Each structure stands twice: as C-alpha cells, then as structure tokens.
Amino acid sequence: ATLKDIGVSAGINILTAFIFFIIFAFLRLQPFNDRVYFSKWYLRGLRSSPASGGGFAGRFVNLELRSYLKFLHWMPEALKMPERELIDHAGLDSVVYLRIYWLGLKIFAPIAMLAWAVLVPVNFWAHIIMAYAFTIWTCYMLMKEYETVANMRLQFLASEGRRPDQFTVLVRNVPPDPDETVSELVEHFFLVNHPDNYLTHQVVCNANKLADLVSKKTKLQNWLDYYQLKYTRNNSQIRPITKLGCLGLCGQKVDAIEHYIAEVDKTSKEIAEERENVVNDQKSVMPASFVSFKTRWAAAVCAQTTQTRNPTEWLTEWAAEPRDIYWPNLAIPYVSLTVRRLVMNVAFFFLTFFFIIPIAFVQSLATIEGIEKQGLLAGIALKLFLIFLPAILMTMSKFEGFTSVSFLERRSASRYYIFNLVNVFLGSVIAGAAFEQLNSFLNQSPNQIPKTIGMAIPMKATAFITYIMVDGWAGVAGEILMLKPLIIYHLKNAFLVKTEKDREEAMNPGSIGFNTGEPQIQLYFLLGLVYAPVTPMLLPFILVFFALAYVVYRHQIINVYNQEYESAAAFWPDVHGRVITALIISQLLLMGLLGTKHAASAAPFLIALPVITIGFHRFCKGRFEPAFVRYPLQEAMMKDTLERAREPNLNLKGYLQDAYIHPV
C-alpha cells in the first residue's frame, strides 16, 4: 500500500495499457477488423471499404511494423481534427462529451499543482485554504465550461439545416372529446390558440405492435438466415426453445430454415393484420400529436408556454429529433407518469442498497450449478449485475415515461451516478454492505456522518489509486481495442451475412454511451475533489485517466462511434450538477476529516464552503441552464428571418408532415 507498491502496480497497468495499444495497432492494420475500427468513416461514406478499399493486405503478412509509433501514432492523429470539424463530423454531443475529460484536466491539473506546492510540502489551516481554492477553481471552470457549452449549443442550433424539431412541438395528454378525434382536437386547438403560425400536425398512433411485428419479421428471417443460406434445400433447421430464444437444436421446433419459413410468412400476415388495426381504426391514435409551426419562434413559444387551465393537459414540449423520439413512451398519461416515477424512485432505493441480498441468491444458485458438471465460475454474482446495471437503469427510465432517447440516457446516467456514489465510493470508504452503511448513517449524528467517512478517506486512498489504474487506465485502453464489437461483427459477417451489396452492416458500435461513460467520468471527478485537500497523490492518477480517456474517446468519436441522436449538448446541466455534487461531498468530508483529527476552529470556514457552492450552482441554473432547455425567442426569430430571406419559398408543410410518423 506504499508508494513502492503503488508504483509497481502503476507500471503494471501502464504496461497493460501499452499491450492493449499494441494489439490495437495490430488489428487496425488488418482489413477484417477495419469495418469495426473505422465504422463512422463508412457511416459517413468517407471511407470506401474496410482497408480504405477493402479486403486488402497489411494484415498478418507484415504483422505490425515493430516500432514505438505503431501504437502511439493514433494519439496525435486523434487530436489533429479541429473541434469544429468534429462538430460536423460526429456531433456537438460527442464534442462536449470530450469536453468533460478536458474539464477534468482543466480542474484537477491546476489543483494538483496547488496541492503539490502547498499540501504535500506541509504534510491544518493550509488544508482549508487549499479546499477553498480548489472549490473556487472548480466553480470557475464549471462556469466557464457552462458558458462555452451554451455558446456551442446556440451556435449549433443557429447553423442547423432546417431540423424538423425546431418547428415542431410534442403536445401530450390531449383531452378526449366525445365527437372530435385527437386529430381534430389538435387542429382546432392550435388554430385558435396559435392561429398565425399553426402549420400542420402529426397525431401519434400506437404503432408499437406494428413495429414489433415488422422487426420480428426481419428478426426471424435473419434468425436462421445463416442456416438458410448455408446450402439451401434442407439445412440445419435449429430449434431455439421459446423461453429465451437463443439456444438452437435444443427444443422441438425443427421444421425448416429462415425460422421455419411458414412462421416468418405468418409474421407477415400478422403485420398486415396489425396494419389494419393501427391505420384504419382511430383507437390506436394516442392522445398526443406533433404540432408543427411555420416559424421556430412560434414553436418555441408553444413549447415554453402553458396552453390550457389544466397544466397537465395539452402538454406542449419542444419535440425531440425524429430519431430521438422514443415512440413507446408517448402513450403515458400524466397521472400514470407521476406514479411510474415514484415507483421507480423507490425501486431505485432498493436497487442501490438492498441489491446484494438478491445477488447472493443468484450466487447460491451459481454454487448449485457449480456442483452440476474448468468450472470455478469466477465473477457471476455482482460482476454480471454490474454489467447489466446500465441496462436495468435504462429500463427504469423507460418505465418512468421519458419520450426521448436522450432523456432516457440522461436519467440512466443520473441513476448510475447515485448507484456508484453509494456502492463504489461509499462502498470502499465504509466496510459495510450498502444497506449496512445506510443503517449506520441513519443511526449516526448529522455531524458524525461526515466525520466517519471523512476519517475513512485518507486510509484507503491507495485502494482508489488502484481503481484509477485499473478501471480508468486499462479500462480506457481496452475501449480503444474495441474487442467486443470486433467479435460481434466477426460472428455476423461469417454467420448471417446474406447481403446483396453492403446491407448487413453491424459495423456501427453505437454512440459514446452517456448513460454509462459519463457516470464513470463523474466518479473520478468526485475522487479527485474528495482527495485533493486530503491526499494530493490521487490527482496524478486521475489526470492520467483524463488525458488518456480524452485521446482514446476522441479517436473513437472520430473513427468508430456514431451518434444515434443529437441533443445539441442538452445534457450539460446534468454534468454540471454532478460536479457540484462532487464539490459539496468533498467539502462535507473535509469538514469531517478536520472534525476528527481537528476540533472546530476551521469548521466555521468549511461550513461556509457548501453554501457558496450551492449559491454558485443556483446562479448557474439561472444563467446558463435555461439555454439548454428552451429556445431563446430572439435566437429563433433570427434564424427564421435569415432563412426566410435565403429561401422565401420553402413549403415547410410537406417537410414537417412525414417527419413524425412511426413505422409507416
């Protein structure tokens, strides 16, 4: 646990990271992995095929040219593309996600210098003076980044090429009328409440079932497509027992290939059936619509104004991108939404505390199947639970009722942050098992809560040092290796490929993953903030994470990751708030550190620190935050007038009609 041991394991993890980079160098040279290494280039049509042309050499023929730059040249190349070029290449979302790693460097590097010029030399009132300085710096940089990100968001919005969302709002909870249909309701309401600029509307229908059947048709057609086109005629007609699917040759449903041909044919028949009961029925039409407007000014007005006496009816919100729209959650009434939120909030309480008890039942079952029939089963219990944590948290957000993928990801990120605050941070600082710590803190005095955890932090700082080295150095180096997506596409292009040209494209590796990646960054923000005044040694390791992660994720954002939505950096308020949380926790734990090892002569100053931070947060929530949720009316009008001068003949009607349909 000493510097020697820390440095030994640092060297080990630096070498593990370097090994990962070497394998990355090797595999990025070979065409057969280039599809899932340069994905975004083919998604943008800038790269032709795999090895800049496809199916070429440069593979194991020359292996990898043994040098130092083989595994190091991708780093300056990632940093070569200008930030603005990346705003058009990848997007604003990804460019500001990169800015969180840069924010970490911008905060923790100057505070490491301060700590290593004051704290370590004199290792107190210097502790509290440094704490004050660190918080002032964090706040200054938070405000400056809030500014830059808001300016970037507004520049993006102003340079947008007629996005449908800009002119449309999502009216929800449309009150039912005995005679008038949802369509007529929306039309007449917005023709009298927003007369001048009402353009058109698109009523949301419940075509979730229809979409499911179409997607299942393709799923079944590709289920045994590998098998179908292995040799045609009668191939390996597998039987994926219908309880988990997957399997294969284990059930009793042998039949034929392409998922028993007549079965995929009956899926087409079901599509037709549902089509009738989605299009020509008027009961599938949900109480929601996408009201489009002639101007972005009027759409902004509608979104940010209350329409009727019941504020829960006619809920007009700025519509999200057609691709960001999460269609299943458009069928949720206001009252239902509120109940669902509360249900998931209390389910999360149990998820973040009493999750080890059900995990121990899974482990009891793992020992049972360990006896049954090399074995060992290393991991399972908590390991798999943590792998599926983002998925569980995502489904909880879906339950709540967020009608946009962006907001689902943002909610899942918030939940993951709280999970990791309790189970990664406090799980290490306190030796109890989540709910054990909960009970202890409930039975602890409000002054002694901070004291217990604040006295605990300096001790296991070395444990958190290894956390950065493993989950933030080697973790991000494995991200550059992209091993999992490689394997997936290897077992898709050699399995169910069946494409005329390039239609089987499983190259896309999704996006950055705000729901998972961001909570990780924020846990390191927390670690750095908490330890900065206490033990300044954590900061160097945190900074290596931030630098490495900036470069590995920049590379991925440019080369591999492809955005699924464009929120135009609307998640920055969330990021800001989580660094503010980290700041407040840091100060509380410093009051506790110097409340156990010191009395309360410096505590009055460390009690003012949280107040200042909350005041700053409130200032930032009123200064920068509204630019991320609302369209400034001036900005909207400027864009409108400019666009109306450029093109004074645009028929926004037709454009905005088909912008918001589901699978039709």
Added chain:
Amino acid sequence: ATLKDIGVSAGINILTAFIFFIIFAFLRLQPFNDRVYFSKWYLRGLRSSPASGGGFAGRFVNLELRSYLKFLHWMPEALKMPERELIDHAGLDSVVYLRIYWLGLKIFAPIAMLAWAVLVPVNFWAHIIMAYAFTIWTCYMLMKEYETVANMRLQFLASEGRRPDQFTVLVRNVPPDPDETVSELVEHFFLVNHPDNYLTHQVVCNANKLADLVSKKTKLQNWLDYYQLKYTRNNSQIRPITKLGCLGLCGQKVDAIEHYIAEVDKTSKEIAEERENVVNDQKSVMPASFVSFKTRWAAAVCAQTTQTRNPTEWLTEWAAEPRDIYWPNLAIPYVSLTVRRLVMNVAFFFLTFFFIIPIAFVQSLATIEGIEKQGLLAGIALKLFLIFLPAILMTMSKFEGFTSVSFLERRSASRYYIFNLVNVFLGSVIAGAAFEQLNSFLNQSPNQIPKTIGMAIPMKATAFITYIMVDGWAGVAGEILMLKPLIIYHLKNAFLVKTEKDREEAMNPGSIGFNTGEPQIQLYFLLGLVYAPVTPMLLPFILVFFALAYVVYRHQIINVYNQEYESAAAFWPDVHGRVITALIISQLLLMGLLGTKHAASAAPFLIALPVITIGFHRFCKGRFEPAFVRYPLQEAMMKDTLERAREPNLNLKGYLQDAYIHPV
C-alpha cells in the same frame, strides 16, 4: 394540566373573548369609532359617513342594549354575504384567505371525529391507521381546495375589466447599449422579437428619491399641522430631534410651525431639483421597462418565454398590478439579486436561532434603564422582538429584491412560518433555546431526531391547548375589537385632521396581512396535524379557533379591511406547501413517537407516509400550481377574442402608457 385546569382556562378565555365581543358591540354602536369599524364601506362609498350618516346618536346615550345578540349578531351577518359578492366587494385574495380557515375546519373536523371514534376510545396500530387516514384526508382536501382556488383564480382573471397587468410584462435586466437608450433598446427588441403584438412600453426610472421628497413634503406639512392650525400665528413650534424624529419640544429646532415653514418650502425646492434629475437626465432610467402588448395572449407568451441567449438578461415576467408594483426593487441587477438572496438566507438562519443572544443584550439595557428613574418593564426583550418580527422579515424580503408587494408579503410569510416552526413549535416541544436545540439535533442521529421531539409532543399538549385559547381565541376576538386602529384614528382626527372635506382619512386599516395572519393559521394546521394521532384533545380547540377566526376575519374583510393589491389568489401554492410541510412533520414525529414507545413494526408503514405526501405534493405542483404563476394561453385568447368582439375599437395604447409611471 388536567382536563379540569384546561376547562377552567377555556372558560376564562371564552369569557375573555366574550368580553371583547361586548366591547366591540359597544364601540361599533358609536359613530366616533365607526370610521375605523366600517372602513371598507366608506372606502367603497357604500356607507355615507361614520354612523350611516355620521356624527349621530346610538353612543353612550343608550350604551349598548343589554342582550345576547348585541355581541352575537355580527356573526351571522358576516356569513350572510355570498362568497361571490365578497369576491367583488373585497377581492379574491381575501376570499381565499378566508378559505384557509374553512380548509382547517374541512380537514380537522372530520379527523377529530375519526380520532374521537377510534383513538380516544382505544387509548398502537390504530395510531398508524389513523395517521394514514388523516393524511389521506388532508391531501384530499388540499387537492380539492387547490382545484377550487385555481378555478376561482381563473374565473376572476376571465371576468377582469381590462386590468393593465394582463397586457403588460416587466422586462428586467435590459442589457446596456453604448448608443441606444433603455427605451430604444426595449422598443427595438420587442418590435423584432414580438413584432405582431408589441404595443407600447414604459421604462422604469429611478424616481424613488423624487417620491421620497414629495412624501416628505407632505410628511413635514402634516408634522406640525396639528400645531400650525391650533391657533395659527405662533403656536407650539415643537422640536423633534432628528435622530428618531418623534419626540417634540426636546431638540433645539424650535423655529416655526408646519415643520418650520421654510423647511417644508425647501422640501418643495428639493422636489423641483430631483424632478430635473429624474425626468431630463436619462441616467435615472433603470434597466427595466413595462412592455405592453396588444393582446393578453402575447403578454402571456412574453412572460412565459425566454427572450435571449442570456436567460438572466431581458427577464420578462408577468407585470404585477400597477398598485402592487414595489418600485424601489426594480433597480436590482440579476447578480446582485442572487447575492442578496443568499445574504438574507444566512441572516435568517441567525435570526431564527441566534436571536435570543442579541435580545438578552437589549434586556440587559432594559435593566439599566429600569434602575434609571410604575417601572417593572414587563415584556420588552422577546415581546417587542416578536411584535417587530413581521417588519424585520418584510425588510429582508425587500432586500432580496421582490418587485411586487404581493411577493414581498409571501416571502415574509414563508420566513415567519419557518421562524414559528423553530421558535413556537420546537421552542415549546424542546426546552432548549433555539440554537441549543439546533446543536442537540445536529449531534442527534437522524432516527433519534424524530424520536426526541416525537416523545416530547404528548407531554406538553396541554401547553399548546392554552396557546390556542390565548393566541387563537382571545387573539382573534381582539382583532374584531380593532383597538389599535381605533386609537390611531382617534389621535389623528383630534390631532392633525386639517381637511376641507374628507381628505384626512386614516380609516383604512390595511389588508388582512398575509405576511402575519397566514403563518398563524399554518401553525395551527401544524399543531392539529401533529397532535391528531397522538392526543385528539387538541383538535376541539383548534376547531374553535378556525370557526371563530373565519367569522371574525369575514367580518373584518367585509367591514374594515381593504385590499392594497390583487394577486388573484396567487399565494395558494405557498399555503398548500405549508400544509404539506405540516403533514410531513406530523408523520415524522409519529414515527418518532412510535419509535420510543414502540419498536419498528409499524415504522415501515409510517416511512411510506412521507413518500406518499411528497408524491402528492409533486402531483399538485404540476397540476394546479402552474395556473397560479402563468396565464394559460387558451384563457388569454378567449378573453382577448371576447373583448375584441364586445369593443372592437379599444385604444389599448393610451390606457397602457400611463398605467406604469411612478410619482409622475
């Protein structure tokens, strides 16, 4: 402390209240007090002069006709006027203030019945079952009153006769321009951002100094007007030493009458001076304006929409009534406002806890002047502090920066509630002195905080019973007596009267006083809620307060009190939230009561209770709350279209121009 003693003091306080009613009967029969007993009738011009004609008989000639109805007939007469008639007579604000007393009866009477049919008979799981029922009932009635009050607010707004506020917004923090003046900025911004419906604007100037001088001119003219017109020539030229004013014949400034004539003449000269530097200077013009619109729809839009990239600039808010506008607070920048808020928040922390220490210094000085030169000085210390509490809290709100009298009163009410929660409620339940209790609770476990105060409550329930009897029975009976305003006008009509006809009118007794009266009601809501499951005996006394106060305040609202502003019940969200606070506190303290006298077999149910209450609050904050802060666009449009059909020739321009000027 037994039922005998409680009943003896109840009889005493019932008799004290009855004595007060008897004196009220006497004085309301005599013309010389009728001016300050039927004030609102003369303010509405419905009553001619004092004794329905003025200066008549019915005074001490017949004293008071000895009966029972002499002091009891005003009660059914108060309840005779229909609620809607009182909406036009007094106002919606006063009619919904009365509804808070009625809400108390609507909540605590059914819960007293429940408690007196279950709890007292079996005096537990009945305790927690009753707690559940009580909270469900409170919530049901809170939701139902939120509904009725919102409906009344919207009916009022829809039936308003062209109020200036409906068409105007208050833009604040207008960004400075080197060339353009504030007026031109506002004009051009709202001609391009809200082109269609921009009507006119009225830039706020800093005419606070001008107004002060005009008000001081009148003050000085009336200072020694009594003296001036006692016998004219050379009367009693008093000398109010200029350090506290008041005094009289104690300084060295004898000179002349009417505040030394040439002195009031120089005040007129100063008025002229300031007039030049307010009107013709363009630096007195503050960065704010009152932008009027052609429609209420456009004004609503402007108010509820963000205008520019900086959400802290061009802060458009629904303008308050011209008479509600607090002019001095229009000169506060956004950043300043935020700092002022935080400063006053921390000053309130010390005000609600460490206020006894400065009060003891005042008491130390009181003993010093007690020695100096019948004496005794009963009260002083805390007594006078509590008298001036609403005033102190009001000035704190003024500091913060609320630009409307309504909002100043609402803030002062919120602060007074918190003060009384800590110093009247917890001050009685815990024997410490505010900050002593603070320290104890900080050093108490989060589970034992509720336990300590929850174990304390049943003991001094009798002390709180006497509180209702004194501050809520005899207190409200003294309100009907209106002794203080009587004395004031007696020493004004016999002092500085000097009126040609009826110009010296100090009959107006102000309004209900939301900043003081409402916190009192809410403390009794708290008491009733806290004690309902524990000791049901408090409820009868609480209900007598609610009934008596309804009738005494109804009488005052009709006969005496005159509204100074019309918020159209916009303070109901505040009321609702304070009853929700009371509910949550009740449940927390019941978990503590049954955590000391019981283990934790019923605690899991009593831990769900707060969650339900917060969930209900959130539902109500999204369902009814937005109707109190925003103008529904549909409602606005309906009113506009109707009015444009009735009168299609209205020149709103001229009407809305002079609507928002200060002393000009």
